[PDB]
Every structure is written in structure tokens, then in C-alpha cells.
Design an enzyme around this catalytic site. Sequence first.
Site, PDB file in Angstrom:
ATOM      1  N   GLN A  59     -10.549  21.522   6.504  1.00 51.80           N
ATOM      2  CA  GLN A  59     -11.751  21.135   7.303  1.00 51.80           C
ATOM      3  C   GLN A  59     -11.951  21.893   8.473  1.00 51.80           C
ATOM      4  OE1 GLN A  59     -13.362  17.109   6.344  1.00 51.80           O
ATOM      5  NE2 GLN A  59     -11.232  16.501   5.703  1.00 51.80           N
ATOM      6  N   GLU A  73      -2.536  23.377   3.282  1.00 45.14           N
ATOM      7  CA  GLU A  73      -3.667  22.870   2.633  1.00 45.14           C
ATOM      8  C   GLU A  73      -4.766  23.303   3.182  1.00 45.14           C
ATOM      9  OE1 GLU A  73      -6.382  18.847   1.554  1.00 45.14           O
ATOM     10  OE2 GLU A  73      -4.420  18.567   2.673  1.00 45.14           O
ATOM     11  N   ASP A 107      -3.254  12.673  -3.835  1.00 48.58           N
ATOM     12  CA  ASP A 107      -3.019  11.286  -2.666  1.00 48.58           C
ATOM     13  C   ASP A 107      -4.348  10.619  -2.444  1.00 48.58           C
ATOM     14  OD1 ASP A 107      -3.873  13.671  -0.850  1.00 48.58           O
ATOM     15  OD2 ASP A 107      -4.092  12.141   0.609  1.00 48.58           O
ATOM     16  N   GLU A 108      -4.337   9.315  -2.374  1.00 47.60           N
ATOM     17  CA  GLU A 108      -5.538   8.546  -1.928  1.00 47.60           C
ATOM     18  C   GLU A 108      -7.120   8.885  -2.475  1.00 47.60           C
ATOM     19  OE1 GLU A 108      -5.769   9.545   2.420  1.00 47.60           O
ATOM     20  OE2 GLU A 108      -4.235   7.873   2.862  1.00 47.60           O
ATOM     21  N   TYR A 149       5.341  12.539  10.691  1.00 49.36           N
ATOM     22  CA  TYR A 149       3.861  12.614  10.815  1.00 49.36           C
ATOM     23  C   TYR A 149       3.328  12.780  12.451  1.00 49.36           C
ATOM     24  CZ  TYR A 149       2.405  11.870   5.947  1.00 49.36           C
ATOM     25  OH  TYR A 149       1.984  11.936   4.666  1.00 49.36           O
ATOM     26  N   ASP A 193      -6.960  15.371  11.460  1.00 51.74           N
ATOM     27  CA  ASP A 193      -7.709  14.000  11.404  1.00 51.74           C
ATOM     28  C   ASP A 193      -8.901  14.162  12.322  1.00 51.74           C
ATOM     29  OD1 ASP A 193      -6.159  12.471   9.664  1.00 51.74           O
ATOM     30  OD2 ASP A 193      -4.766  11.842  11.056  1.00 51.74           O
TER      31      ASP A 193
HETATM   32  C1  LIG Z   1      -0.779  12.840   1.990  1.00 47.99           C
HETATM   33  C2  LIG Z   1      -1.401  12.035   3.266  1.00 47.99           C
HETATM   34  O1  LIG Z   1      -0.852  11.577   4.096  1.00 47.99           O
HETATM   35  N1  LIG Z   1      -2.818  11.687   2.879  1.00 47.99           N
HETATM   36  C3  LIG Z   1      -3.798  11.422   4.192  1.00 47.99           C
HETATM   37  C4  LIG Z   1      -3.001  10.102   4.817  1.00 47.99           C
HETATM   38  N2  LIG Z   1      -2.096  10.419   5.945  1.00 47.99           N
HETATM   39  C5  LIG Z   1      -1.609   9.365   6.838  1.00 47.99           C
HETATM   40  C6  LIG Z   1      -1.717  10.029   8.158  1.00 47.99           C
HETATM   41  C7  LIG Z   1      -2.710  11.292   8.238  1.00 47.99           C
HETATM   42  O2  LIG Z   1      -3.586  10.938   8.912  1.00 47.99           O
HETATM   43  C8  LIG Z   1      -2.446  11.682   6.805  1.00 47.99           C
HETATM   44  C9  LIG Z   1      -4.015  11.850   6.415  1.00 47.99           C
HETATM   45  O3  LIG Z   1      -4.465  12.805   7.256  1.00 47.99           O
HETATM   46  C10 LIG Z   1      -3.867  12.501   4.967  1.00 47.99           C
HETATM   47  O4  LIG Z   1      -4.999  12.931   4.470  1.00 47.99           O
HETATM   48  C11 LIG Z   1      -5.258  14.470   4.711  1.00 47.99           C
HETATM   49  O5  LIG Z   1      -6.460  14.603   5.644  1.00 47.99           O
HETATM   50  C12 LIG Z   1      -6.856  16.048   5.715  1.00 47.99           C
HETATM   51  C13 LIG Z   1      -7.793  15.927   7.038  1.00 47.99           C
HETATM   52  O6  LIG Z   1      -6.785  15.511   8.128  1.00 47.99           O
HETATM   53  C14 LIG Z   1      -7.488  16.417   4.342  1.00 47.99           C
HETATM   54  O7  LIG Z   1      -8.647  15.757   4.389  1.00 47.99           O
HETATM   55  C15 LIG Z   1      -6.461  16.033   3.310  1.00 47.99           C
HETATM   56  O8  LIG Z   1      -7.190  16.455   2.277  1.00 47.99           O
HETATM   57  C16 LIG Z   1      -5.851  14.808   3.357  1.00 47.99           C
HETATM   58  O9  LIG Z   1      -4.940  14.565   2.483  1.00 47.99           O
END
Ligand SMILES: CC(=O)N[C@H]1CN2CC[C@H](O)[C@@H]2[C@@H](O)[C@@H]1O[C@@H]1O[C@H](CO)[C@H](O)[C@H](O)[C@H]1O
EC number: 3.2.1.140
Length: 633
Positions: free
Chosen positions: A161, A187, A291-292, A390, A438
Site C-alpha cells: 500500500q 509483500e 490470511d484474514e 511483530y 499499518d
Molecule cells: C498475516 C498478518 O499478520 N495479517 C495481518 C494482521 N497482522 C497483525 C499485526 C499487523 O498489524 C498485521 C497486519 O498488518 C496484517 O495485514 C497486512 O496488512 C498490510 C498493511 O499493513 C497488507 O494489507 C497485508 O495484505 C496484510 O496481510
Amino acid sequence: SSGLVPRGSHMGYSATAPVNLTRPATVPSMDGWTDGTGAWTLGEGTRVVSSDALAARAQSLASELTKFTDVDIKAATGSATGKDISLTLDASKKAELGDEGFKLNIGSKGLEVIGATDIGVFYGTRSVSQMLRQGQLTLPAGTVATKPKYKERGATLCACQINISTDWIDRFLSDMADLRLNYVLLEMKLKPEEDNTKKAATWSYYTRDDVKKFVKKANNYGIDVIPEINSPGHMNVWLENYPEYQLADNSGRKDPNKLDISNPEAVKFYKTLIDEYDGVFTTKYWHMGADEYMIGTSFDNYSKLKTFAEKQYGAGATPNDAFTGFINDIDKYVKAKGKQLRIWNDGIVNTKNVSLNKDIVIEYWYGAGRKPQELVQDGYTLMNATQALYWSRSAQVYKVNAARLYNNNWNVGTFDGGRQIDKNYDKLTGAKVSIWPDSSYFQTENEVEKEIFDGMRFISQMTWSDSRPWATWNDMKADIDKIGYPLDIREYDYTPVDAGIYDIPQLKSISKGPWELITTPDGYYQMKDTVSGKCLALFTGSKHLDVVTQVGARPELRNCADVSVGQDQRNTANERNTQKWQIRADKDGKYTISPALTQQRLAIATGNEQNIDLETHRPAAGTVAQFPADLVS
Ligand SMILES: CC(=O)N[C@H]1CN2CC[C@H](O)[C@@H]2[C@@H](O)[C@@H]1O[C@@H]1O[C@H](CO)[C@H](O)[C@H](O)[C@H]1O
């Protein structure tokens, strides 16, 4: 008077050395060092010697060491003296050293580095660098052999992003190499070019040229760059402009994050993207995320997936079956390209009519079903991607605490939520930290770099050595700071121009200027317009992760924020960080200005720039706006 004076020891070996001369630390630690007689001193005349085959490694180390030691260290071929560092590749030592391990012999024949592969020898040289760049040029004699306990050691870097600059990735890759980390899950978005995919060419993206460059740097450092395109969830940056592929709930509402896996044109679109990436990544792996998918909701609101399951995988089939079936189908596709598939564990669910192929590597981040122990019993290949490793720029629950993991006996077998499996499980590939953007304005990428320092040393130590030779975290911390960063990071020109008053023609449409430039602790500039008294900001436009990703967004003048404070001033973070600018020197001598958060470049708009965002809004021609660099070369 004391008579304090430098020892000034002669170069080369000496049979004489004090019994407790310090052996400079490394990370990873090299355990089971066998002390010998005497010590070896790098000094004038010391050369790095190798075969022709190792000539590039030798020349690069000689250079490096010249810079760290202030001694002129040349590379050479032919015979080595007791004065020299020797590099040796001996492939017959695979049993002892593996693909990555190395041996050091320090003694009368000088400092010998032995590896069974090019990368092992390279890796030996990282310890040699570490050992000699702490202000001590005399190393105690002896010998040690070391190799990594785990095969995969590194990081998830979400360059997703938002854009993480290729200069940051480069520095990260050198940091990884210094720490003998060989794995990065990247990613990211590779700029899509096909007529079928090009409406997803929104920012962040990386060009094919950008990727081939950092991948080739990676491979020279022994680092496998594995790409990720998360699917079938978290797909906003791909499906935003392709609503035809988005999944609708029962009431007809579409989510740009969700791929409609019952739509074969949508599956095909995803497979098209796999094919676009295949040209520029050398890795043998594909990571499809998984994921998610249903975060914020449930499969009960997508009855279409149940109907699809039953048609596709027979009566009794559930949405979870369709999900796994999608994963298995992508598995089959990448295997036909010669690749192995990888996913996140939270995808793996209770399936009636379908079961997940066991040839899929499971990266385990979330304690939610199966537990790690159960995945072990069924024979899965597992990488430990625990949330305890993380970082998130916005989510403060995600901050690696390396002191705590070190002092509490965490190891690579300690999966998410303190679920310990056998750390010698034969299909445990290793472990990684994870670097997530994030909500991205809270911390600049250079702030992320400062913060992750410690956690990167921690994961290097435990994936390679799996030992705690420092009595406490605080001892390890002392040594890792003395070791410090590799040369490329110490050399990166963060702020190439001095603070001061500048004329900047590129900015005339905002103000005739001149502009006051001051530097920030994270390596950026604030730019004050001496006419208005206000500061230049990239503040307005369409955003992802709360950062302006819009191609062609215009900067503006805002009241000056305080750019001198740290990331713990979360309350003013957006005003502050939208006022940070990175300045870079060209090859050679011309300067580009980039908003620190977005990493696009300021340019005068021509009106000939081609991007999907510009079809919907284009800044007035001749004004200064941000654009990806590939649109303004
Ligand atoms: C695999 C994973 O950890 N998935 C999301 C949840 N985790 C927990 C803490 C983190 O905040 C993290 C998220 O950032 C993860 O999602 C990813 O987000 C990024 C942007 O920050 C992208 O949108 C990825 O596709 C998501 O998998």
C-alpha cells in the site's frame, strides 16, 4: 605521569598474546571457539588473498576493511602470508559446514576463512568484518566452525500500500547479510503492465527494473526474496479498480479486499499476476498469503461460496472447503511453474470435503486452529512467524521486546502465544520477524530502521546459533552496539545537503522562495518558505494506510510542525511527518525531493504522465506534484 602509549603491535601473527585479550563479539555468536597460541594483527601490508573465483569477494572485503581500519588493505591472488586474510571455498566440507556455515582459523598462517559454498565464504567474511571494526586490530588465535541451526532466517517486510524506498530495501538487505539472515518475504506490488491488470498500477508499486536490481543485490548476499500477493483477502490494492472481481455478500455489497474465488475470471486475474512476477523474482517460492479473508465478517454472509463449494467439491462442502480448494488450486498452478507454495496459518481451517496439500509451507503467526502441536502431528512444514516478533508503525501492541524474549528463553520452537513445539522438529524451517506499516504516518521508514535494530540481532542469533552466550540481554546489547551497522548503512548519504537557505525553481508555483532547509533526526528535511513563513507538506489526496498514495497530488504550505521530536509524539505525527522530505543526489549532482512518507518524487507536471489515477484527476500542467519516479525519468 602514567606513560600511557599505544601498544602498536606489528602486523601478522605473534606467538605472544595476553591470555585474556578480548575476542571481539559477533552476531550471530560463533560458539565453541577453540583458543590457540598467540594472536593475529591486521596491519600495513595485510592483504585479502584468494583464488580468481573468489576475487570479487576478496576485493569487496579489502575495500570494506580499508574503510573501517584506516589501513590500505589490497586484495590479491597467489600465496598468502601470516599477514593476510585468506578466503577459501572448499566444497568437500559440506558435511561439516553445510550450504551456509564457515570456519575461521586464526594463527601463524594468518586469518583463514573457509566455506563450503560461495555464500558460506561470504558469511565468514561478515564475521571477519564484525570482529575487526570494533577498534581492535589484534584477534586472539584459534579456531571455530559454525553453521545455522535453521534454514530460513529473516523478516517479513510489508512494502504494501505504502512504498518502502528501494534505497531502504537496499540498506535492509545489507543489514540482513551482515546478520547472516537469508530470508525476506516481500509483500509488494510489482507494477502491472498487461491490459488485463494495468488498472491496478496505483502507488505503491515497484518497477521491473527496481525489482531486478534489489533481487540481484539480494542473491549476491545469499538472500532469498520471496514475493507475496495476498489473496483471497487483503486485496484492496489489486481489486479497487476491478469491482468485477470483488466478492459480494448476500445483500450484494462488494468488498475491494475480497477476491471472488467462485469467479474464474477473478482467479485468472490472480494467476496473471503470478505470471507477471515470475519474470523478475529468482526464488523458488510463491506466497499467496491467505490470511484474514473474513476479518470484520463471517462466511455466513457469503452464501455464494457455499453453493460454489457444493458444486465444486460435492454435497456437504463448506465455504472453508472452497477456501482451501482455492489454495490447492494455486498450489497446483505454482508447482507447474517449478515453485513451492507458502501461506499464513490462519487460512488453514476445518474442512469436510477437501484437505490442504501438505506440500505447502505453513508460516505460523496466529494461535487459532490448528495449534502448532497439531500441525506437527499431521506432518506440516512450519516456519515460526510469531506475533511476538511483530513491529507495526501504528499498533503499539506490536513492538518486539528483544530483552524479554532473550531473558525469558524464547526459541524458534516457541510458537505464537508461548505454544512450544520441539525446536528440533525436522520440518521446522526457522523463524522471522515481521515489519508491518499499518497506519503509516506515525513513524517514517527511517524511524522503523532505528527501531528494528535490536530485534534483527535477536532473530539472527536465535535462528543461527540458538544459544545465549551473553548472561543477559544487556550484555548482548552492549556487544551488538559495538558491532554496529555494516558499511553500506554507515555510508548512506541520508542528508546530502547542508541545512541552510536555498533557491529551488521546481517549487516556484508554490512560492518564489527562497527556502530554509533544516535536517531531522531521522534523516529528512523540513522546508520553510521564507516568503509565507509556512512549511511545505504533502498532506492532501487519496490515501491508503492514512498516507497520501495519490499519483499527482500536490504539496501545500502549512504551519510549521516541530520536526525535531521522536515517534513517541504520536499526537502530532501526521502534521510532523507530512512535513518531512527526503533529498537525494543523482548520478551525478542533481537533486530530487520526495515526500518522506509517500516516496514519490516532486516534479513539474507535463500532462503526459500515464497512470490510472491520472485518468480520474490530473493536477494542472506545469504545477509541481508528486509522481512515482518511473513517470518522470
Ligand atoms: C498475516 C498478518 O499478520 N495479517 C495481518 C494482521 N497482522 C497483525 C499485526 C499487523 O498489524 C498485521 C497486519 O498488518 C496484517 O495485514 C497486512 O496488512 C498490510 C498493511 O499493513 C497488507 O494489507 C497485508 O495484505 C496484510 O496481510
